[PDB]
Amino acid sequence: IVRPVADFSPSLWGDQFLSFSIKNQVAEKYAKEIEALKEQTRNMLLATGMKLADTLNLIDTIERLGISYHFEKEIDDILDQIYNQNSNCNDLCTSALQFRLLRQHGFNISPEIFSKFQDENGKFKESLASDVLGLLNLYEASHVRTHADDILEDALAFSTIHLESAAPHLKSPLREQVTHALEQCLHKGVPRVETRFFISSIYDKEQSKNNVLLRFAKLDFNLLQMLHKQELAQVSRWWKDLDFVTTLPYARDRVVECYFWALGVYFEPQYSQARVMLVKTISMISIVDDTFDAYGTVKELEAYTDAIQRWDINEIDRLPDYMKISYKAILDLYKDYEKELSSAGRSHIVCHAIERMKEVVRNYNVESTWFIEGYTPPVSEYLSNALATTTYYYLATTSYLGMKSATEQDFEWLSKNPKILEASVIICRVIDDTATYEVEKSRGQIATGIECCMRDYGISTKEAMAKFQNMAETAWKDINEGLLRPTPVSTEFLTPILNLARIVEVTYIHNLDGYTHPEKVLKPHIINLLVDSIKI
Numbered sequence: 334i335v336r337p338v339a340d341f342s343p344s345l346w347g348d349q350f351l352s353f354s355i356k357n358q359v360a361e362k363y364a365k366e367i368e369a370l371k372e373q374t375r376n377m378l379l380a381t382g383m384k385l386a387d388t389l390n391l392i393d394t395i396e397r398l399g400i401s402y403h404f405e406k407e408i409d410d411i412l413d414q415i416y417n418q419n420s421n422c423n424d425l426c427t428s429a430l431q432f433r434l435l436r437q438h439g440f441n442i443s444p445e446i447f448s449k450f451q452d453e454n455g456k457f458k459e460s461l462a463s464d465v466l467g468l469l470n471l472y473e474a475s476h477v478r479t480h481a482d483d484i485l486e487d488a489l490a491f492s493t494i495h496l497e498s499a500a501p502h503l504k505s506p507l508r509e510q511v512t513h514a515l516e517q518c519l520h521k522g523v524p525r526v527e528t529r530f531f532i533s534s535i536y537d538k539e540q541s542k543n544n545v546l547l548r549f550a551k552l553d554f555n556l557l558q559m560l561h562k563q564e565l566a567q568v569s570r571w572w573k574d575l576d577f578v579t580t581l582p583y584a585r586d587r588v589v590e591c592y593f594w595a596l597g598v599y600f601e602p603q604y605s606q607a608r609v610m611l612v613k614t615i616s617m618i619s620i621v622d623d624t625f626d627a628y629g630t631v632k633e634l635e636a637y638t639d640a641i642q643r644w645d646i647n648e649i650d651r652l653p654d655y656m657k658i659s660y661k662a663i664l665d666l667y668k669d670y671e672k673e674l675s676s677a678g679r680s681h682i683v684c685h686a687i688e689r690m691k692e693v694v695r696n697y698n699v700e701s702t703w704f705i706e707g708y709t710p711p712v713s714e715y716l717s718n719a720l721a722t723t724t725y726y727y728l729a730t731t732s733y734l735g736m737k738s739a740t741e742q743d744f745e746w747l748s749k750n751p752k753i754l755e756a757s758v759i760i761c762r763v764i765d766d767t768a769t770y771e772v773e774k775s776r777g778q779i780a781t782g783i784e785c786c787m788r789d790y791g792i793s794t795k796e797a798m799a800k801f802q803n804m805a806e807t808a809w810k811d812i813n814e815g816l817l818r819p820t821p822v823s824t825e826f827l828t829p830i831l832n833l834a835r836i837v838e839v840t841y842i843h844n845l846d847g848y849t850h851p852e853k854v855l856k857p858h859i860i861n862l863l864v865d866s867i868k869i
């Protein structure tokens with residue numbers, strides 16, 4: 334049996350994360366001061382007689398600084414009051430910010446708040462083109478539209494053209510903030526990534542910065558960073574101990590990248606168990622994916638697929654030695670999950686993730702069959718298989734495992750492929766297909782998404798890619814609509830799904846394949862989030 338020649342780049346990081354011993358003195362000192370700062374900030378939030386603009390700016394700043402997770406109740410109360418008071422006497426900057434904050438928190442504020450800034454045709458008044466803070470906040474708001482907000486159809490184009498025009502002559506750090514926003518909007522960014530940028534590059538350099546908030550943000554970020562490093566060390570040791578790097582050498586060695594993805598799903602300390610469980614799943618399914626894509630024979634993949642469906646250690650017999658390796662590891666991992674959720678009485682929920690993994694593997698095999706037969710399915714058939722091979726139904730399901738408040742009812746909701754989940758999955762599917770078309774086409778994958786699209790509609794590669802981009806935009810509008818109250822499950826269980834979509838936008842930014850090539854997109858984020866602390 335002739336195996337393919339391995340072509341995955343080695344891990345970028347070596348052993349540098351393998352060992353992290355926390356400085357307890359420093360961590361304790363940080364936590365003590367943060368408690369004081371937190372109380373000071375709580376009082377800023379609860380101050381009476383603040384103007385609307387000031388209140389919104391404060392909330393926005395605390396959110397961008399990445400410390401809003403300390404104040405979920407205070408912020409929710411304040412935003413609810415603003416929503417219900419329904420004010421109208423504002424300028425563009427305040428109106429756009431108000432719209433964005435409320436929509437992001439699920440308050441369905443009417444887009445009619447923008448009508449006073451438009452002519453008779455719903456086009457934004459170009460007389461506003463010299464209002465940079467207005468344009469910036471309009472730009473950010475334009476990304477949180479639903480299908481009911483066609484009033485705002487012009488907002489992105491309008492704000493973009495005039496921010497571009499103004500940017501080179503703007504004062505710092507406003508120039509840098511505008512330039513950054515044009516590359517990466519806030520709503521679609523990974524929260525810890527945007528927080529790292531905002532604290533260090535913008536807020537630290539604002540003449541009018543509040544020193545209490547800045548110090549709070551820096552200490553909180555660096556203290557949470559200590560937790561993250563501890564987690565990654567624990568996961569790095571778990572990975573090293575499995576030693577796939579040598580027993581399964583055809584496979585990617587990307588546990589640090591998997592950790593970054595888990596960190597994007599949630600960064601808060603209370604999701605520590607959830608993060609570690611999630612990264613282990615992302616690592617393990619990555620192995621499976623590599624086995625289907627670039628090592629296993631048709632015969633081997635069949636047995637593997639069947640073995641996964643039956644989920645029984647007695648099935649190791651039918652597998653080739655190398656396949657035995659990952660199959661036992663997978664079965665052990667889920668046993669570990671069950672064990673880990675035992676003392677909480679939440680062991681029984683692990684079955685939901687297992688069923689989703691079975692689904693992923695079934696569709697990996699279908700994908701293999703298509704490749705082997707040279708089949709190019711219609712788009713509808715393509716998606717019926719290829720949506721699950723994003724692993725995103727599986728990852729969202731996994732993300733709930735370590736969340737202590739997640740109930741069977743939450744898993745029931747998720748199992749029905751609700752709209753917001755389907756949207757996130759679609760975004761991952763079409764953005765990856767656009768970014769990876771040319772390489773996959775080179776390797777003879779005639780059932781890649783864009784190829785299926787081209788043949789089905791009889792259109793060019795350019796036209797197919799535009800169609801796929803449209804599908805992503807529709808999906809983002811569906812995500813935004815899915816956050817609106819009343820929500821079908823607690824918002825806590827929607828945010829991971831939102832964050833999976835954000836991970837897509839960030840990993841494939843500028844249509845780069847940051848998936849297959851870690852150095853291309855992800856390496857600087859990992860350094861900024863997990864190697865370098867923020868200087869105080």
Ligand SMILES: O=S(=O)(O)C[C@@H](O)CNC1CCCCC1
Pocket residue numbers: 594622722723724761762765836837840848
């Ligand atoms: O190439 S596949 O379609 O098999 C898988 C790919 O689409 C998705 N892989 C990662 C998952 C987590 C980070 C974002 C993308």
Ligand SMILES: [Mg+2]
Pocket residue numbers: 622623626
């Ligand atoms: Mg694959």
Ligand SMILES: [Mg+2]
Pocket residue numbers: 765766769770773
């Ligand atoms: Mg691809």
